[PDB]
Amino acid sequence: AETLIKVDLNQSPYDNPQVHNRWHPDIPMAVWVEPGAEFKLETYDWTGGAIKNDDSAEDVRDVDLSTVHFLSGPVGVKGAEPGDLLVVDLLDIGARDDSLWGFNGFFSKQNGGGFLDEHFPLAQKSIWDFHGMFTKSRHIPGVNFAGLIHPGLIGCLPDPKMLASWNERETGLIATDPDRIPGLANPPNATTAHMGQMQGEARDKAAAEGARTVPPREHGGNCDIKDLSRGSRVFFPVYVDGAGLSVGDLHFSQGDGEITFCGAIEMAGWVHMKVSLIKGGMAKYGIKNPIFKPSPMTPNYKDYLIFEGISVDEKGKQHYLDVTVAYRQACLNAIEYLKKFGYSGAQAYSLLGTAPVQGHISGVVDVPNACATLWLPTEIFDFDINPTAEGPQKIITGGVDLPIAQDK
Amino acid sequence: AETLIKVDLNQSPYDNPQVHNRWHPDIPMAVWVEPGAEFKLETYDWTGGAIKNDDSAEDVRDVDLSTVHFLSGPVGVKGAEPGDLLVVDLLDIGARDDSLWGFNGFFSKQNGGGFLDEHFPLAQKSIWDFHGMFTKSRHIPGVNFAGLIHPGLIGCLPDPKMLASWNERETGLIATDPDRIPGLANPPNATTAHMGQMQGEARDKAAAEGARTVPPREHGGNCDIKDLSRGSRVFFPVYVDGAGLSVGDLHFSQGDGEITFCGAIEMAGWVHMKVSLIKGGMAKYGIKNPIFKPSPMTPNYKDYLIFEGISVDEKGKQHYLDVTVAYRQACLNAIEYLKKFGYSGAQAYSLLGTAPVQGHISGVVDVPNACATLWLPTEIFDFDINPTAEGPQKIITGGVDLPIAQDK
Amino acid sequence: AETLIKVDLNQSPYDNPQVHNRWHPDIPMAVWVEPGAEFKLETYDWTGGAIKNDDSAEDVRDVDLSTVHFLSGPVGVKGAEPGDLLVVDLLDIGARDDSLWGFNGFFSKQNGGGFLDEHFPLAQKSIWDFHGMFTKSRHIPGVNFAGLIHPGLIGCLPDPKMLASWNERETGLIATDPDRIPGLANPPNATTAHMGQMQGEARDKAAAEGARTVPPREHGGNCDIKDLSRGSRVFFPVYVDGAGLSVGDLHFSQGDGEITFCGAIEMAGWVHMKVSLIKGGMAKYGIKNPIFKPSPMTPNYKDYLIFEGISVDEKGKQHYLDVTVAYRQACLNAIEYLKKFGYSGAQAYSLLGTAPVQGHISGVVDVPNACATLWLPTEIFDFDINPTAEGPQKIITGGVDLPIAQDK
Amino acid sequence: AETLIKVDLNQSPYDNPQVHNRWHPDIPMAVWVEPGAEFKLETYDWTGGAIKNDDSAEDVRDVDLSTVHFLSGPVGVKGAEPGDLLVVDLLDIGARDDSLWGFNGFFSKQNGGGFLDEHFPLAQKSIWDFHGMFTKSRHIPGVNFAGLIHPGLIGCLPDPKMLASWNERETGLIATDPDRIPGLANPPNATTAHMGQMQGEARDKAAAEGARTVPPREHGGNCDIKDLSRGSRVFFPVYVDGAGLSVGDLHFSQGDGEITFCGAIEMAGWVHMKVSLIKGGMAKYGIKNPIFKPSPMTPNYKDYLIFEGISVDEKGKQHYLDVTVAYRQACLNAIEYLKKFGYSGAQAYSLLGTAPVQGHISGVVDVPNACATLWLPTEIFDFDINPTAEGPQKIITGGVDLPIAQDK
Ligand SMILES: [Zn+2]
Ligand SMILES: [Zn+2]
Ligand SMILES: [Zn+2]
Ligand SMILES: [Zn+2]
Ligand SMILES: [Zn+2]
Ligand SMILES: [Zn+2]
Ligand SMILES: [Zn+2]
Ligand SMILES: [Zn+2]
Description:
Four copies of one chain form a homotetramer. With about 400 residues, the first copy, chain A, is α+β, with helices and mostly antiparallel strands. Chain A has one domain. Chain A is built from six helices and 22 strands. The longest helix of chain A has 17 residues, at about 325-340. At the A-C interface, loops of A face loops of C. β20 (about 305-310) of chain C pairs antiparallel with β18 (about 290-295) of chain D, so a sheet runs across the interface. The structure holds zinc ion (ZN) (8 copies). The site of one zinc ion (ZN) has 7 residues of chain C, from β15 and β16. The PDB classes it as hydrolase.
């Protein structure tokens, strides 16, 4: 299939007019296609080159998070009207031949944070090499797995209404605690905005009101749903004429929650897709957020070891039906378990961000506690991590660990 | 294997000395077994007979929720010491031959509430019949599925310290909003307490400080994890000598979250299990909450239709990394979708509480929005519910709906 | 549901009028049901009590194979006419509460033979205990698995024409080598025939022309398809009015090919089923043999170690597209591999007949060799049997083995 | 990873010195690698360009089957000695970017034949297009599936002894019926032999004794095991120093048996692989034929409709434990079923050769009949093919069919 958007990794994303990093109804289509068209799009990694394949974490700590995410699009679809559904088949996804590695990290609390930032406040990095379908890290010994390759971010352009709501409610929330490190949301920011085929005046009004791509919203966008993977079929709400489908933020793999924030195994690559329409889909099927069907080709792991958490935090304080706090406990429990086998806490945390662990909302009614589970697939280890009568052999030798960078 | 605790459904649970409905370190063992023992335990449904197989919801409206849950146990295991892990193999689980039906319901907001109680505030009920491995409801046409049969509630007796913490933090939370309908937690309550073989003054003492079985806690207890099912192996923390393992609240099936609160498909039944020990297991493996391995025998549904939600509520107000609010959105999206096929909202809500739907914590870092997904297995419908170019057809037409009871 | 055919294991099968052990159009219905009826049938093990739970193989050696199989039925279905399809839902299947064990064996070559009878010519036995969904044998250490519970034999009564063809072609084949040990087929035999409710001369006429139940045929019958298991839906061709569905020969588990001949794990038990009709199904769907849909509840083993064979026998002699010889080599390769871990050959051969191993007709065109594969699920062993750089380790300490009985 | 053997589809395979089409101990290594090396090999389709993407079957009719299969290799592995096992990870496999289509056909009975050549004696062809992970044919409407991408042929060079045995037993078998159309085996043939880098005199001899690659043998070779797919790990017996691993005959998909003979969906492509050794692997693990582990990434089809056959042929003749005849019956039964939905017999036959259907050796003991099953995954049709009460609707219209060529 022909590649309709090409990416040169050594060219600055700002120099590519078919790339953009904010959501706005007025970004012009990077290309137009007919319904039924099938084609490939190439993509920068989300940072657009900021993070390197080496053994230092300073890049993770110093990255300018206002730049993310560099998306390829918007793709225009002829005849697409507001209120349609845009049916997207993800026919395949992969890494570029010249870039067979990816990265996971923990941001510093001072520059982004993450799910377990109170336990791992310093920036770190693991590097992942791709071996066909499989991946592994020089930083995490004894671990090998097939990737669940997915776009972290995909979705259609918002209408004027939608964008106004997003900015209002999100700036409103920053207003309630504007000095929290890390912040509660990210406001529009024109300084580092890439607005596609835009320069001058229209570029500068739109860049000042253009939404950050950081959070998932009603249209889809940055959902980081690992299961929205190569082979899947997704149904997107359409808000503007021609839809304006963009995609980026490709992951070779990811755990549920993407707890590390900085991936997932983040990568540059390509997406091969087919597009079509359901006329008036949104009203016909009562669509608000996207809906999709998962892939018939995914890694078949099923020998899970499953960890539990409840809505009582690390300090012993009682919350109310809080799935977020319950998941944190399940993740911490899994980390504690892994450490008994010789993994550092950073190796374990990176693992939960990268390997295809499951996070279930098992119970959300048994007041006051929600119950959340974290499913660790045991197939990914080249030794048996199941409990036995005699106790764990502390297998993991070496002195290998994830790079760590002191704060600035 | 022999049944070590027998249950007569027509006998009041209070008259059975091997049953109890509060957690307390001093409830004496209902029976003693050797490590390696295999045996069966019979169980009351969680209410102990309050809910009937008929077409009215008044029993659900009027049930005395202080009575739940009637558990079978505690089972003493010889040589079990605090800090051990109790290894339980769930070898099989089923319904009683004389009781081949179960119930799902929504509590009234005035008497219990639930996940979608703002949308369905009146008490309702669906009745499920068991056909070998399979189930269906006269109240929900076109739906048939294999059950994922599991105990909703299982775990070991707390020590004195643990119980004190539970009461302290939970009464503390009630104190912050004591008149809230429904309540934030349930305090100890001696009026409806069944304390097993406890007699005299010690009984009345213990009943006044005995914790409700309603929430999951560090020991396990009422987790309502559907995947802790027949065929699973679970590892419980031991707090007192002999462990004191109790089990109840059997489910023929359940969806992730148990959003309906009143099940799941609640039933009476039996559990066939084997028990063993890992000496000093808790410290060896860094165990706080239980861990387990899921069953090799589960329903193989994989053709999911997957719905999404973010941390923005039904009023449009913006929350911060709130998985609970995101899941509500995903569930409501699923319900809206099913309605287009002719299901009532009540049918849809009941379905999500009963069928083995998956609830994933897909993303919990993309500030401000968490992303939660609800996975509806399409194999359970006897017609195709997948989106087509044509839009849906109302294949659900006709009479039956769930019983509904007006508020007292 | 109600049990329409009851079985007393201590009663001779000949004394039960609702049992039979030959196929004949004139055996009267054991019971009549309406289409849509759901009910249970109890069953003798195929031999009807000949094999015992002990540590000697003499019963296997001496069994009278003319007696097999004692089937429960024929069940009549009101309105069923020749050329219909009888739709049978297998809703559940299990062992009797008073008989929680089963048996596998190798027949002596002198009395039955088997797939590897040139390698294991003496009669042997392994006994299997049922632990809820799971099984294991005191004769084969280190192995545990969830059973794939299925009827080895199920199908409808032949019409007069069909029965005549069966006898003609099968006696014709015996004629080509009548003194062969073991025989090529089994002729009608009135001596040990149980003809249900048939009386007098009519009974006598039928027992002399009644087909042995030993081989699978166009109607179904003794297929020993492990995947025709609890949870399946099967569609049977109907030849006579009322259909006359019979069932027996229940297996707790079996490997593809049932290579040991004497099971499988043979057992007495029960089948819970629902029946219905497709009017004129046979012509509508071009049905000759039965067709079916496998169960949504089966053991999820996927970590196979897969062995190969080609159409060259143990003497090195070249055959032509012979899948039978190819599968023998694949089984023999699997046995040789297992022996390196400390299993006897008999243990391994019993294992392949009992555990849910897969046998695939991988290639049947690459003249002169067919390619057959044997898939051994590695999850059934409590130690890792995968190849490593170091080679195997004799982990099966020994002492215990299958009973063996010298020839008479 | 780097491509160590490159292929120009427009260059004659005879002009590529790193390709060969006969098995012989003396073909020199096309390249040498160290143990632990990972690399790519590109491949011709098995015919090397003979079959074209068009709507006529004459190329299939006229192809010179003495030329097949053009393999890439032999790959030398430093330190590999006879009696070792060569561990091969298949890390990924795909189609070439310039060649995103493949072909299935039936050979004429006069030039190759096939499993159902008595029913389809004239040469035919279906063409398949690749859409990322998925495939479909302009010749078979209503069918879409994810490919189970595998090498049909892979293995190591035989030693002198092995080669002598192969020729002796195979020429011996041709001797028993030398004029048979099609032949029972294919003898060595120097006319169309490509012997890699072998030269002049030494080569003219090797080409006269070099075995055809057509059948699977002890070393592996052309097994056409669909499940030996991308993601798999295979363990090959080593016969000569450096091993000499070759590979070709790549399939995008195939059904069990490869009944159509001419594929499978045959294609040109590439294989990304890693190699390593088990020193003395063959004796350590009692290896005769290869063994392998299937892939964690395969198409997840589960909703099978399963067809049966027994050892009684199309003429009604009775065979003895003949799996080959039983499989033919099961395949013919499946074809008859599909025709009721509007497919031609040719469409159905091509489908069974290409789609990932399963063929099980379900029973091989119930004298006189073997029982074989054919498993059609129903997910591959864009309409429901399951039996219902009112019968099949003839969905397949149009007038498209496979090209057919009259005999030469
Ligand atoms: Zn993302
Ligand atoms: Zn990302
Ligand atoms: Zn519960
Ligand atoms: Zn419950
Ligand atoms: Zn049988
Ligand atoms: Zn049997
Ligand atoms: Zn081949
Ligand atoms: Zn091929």
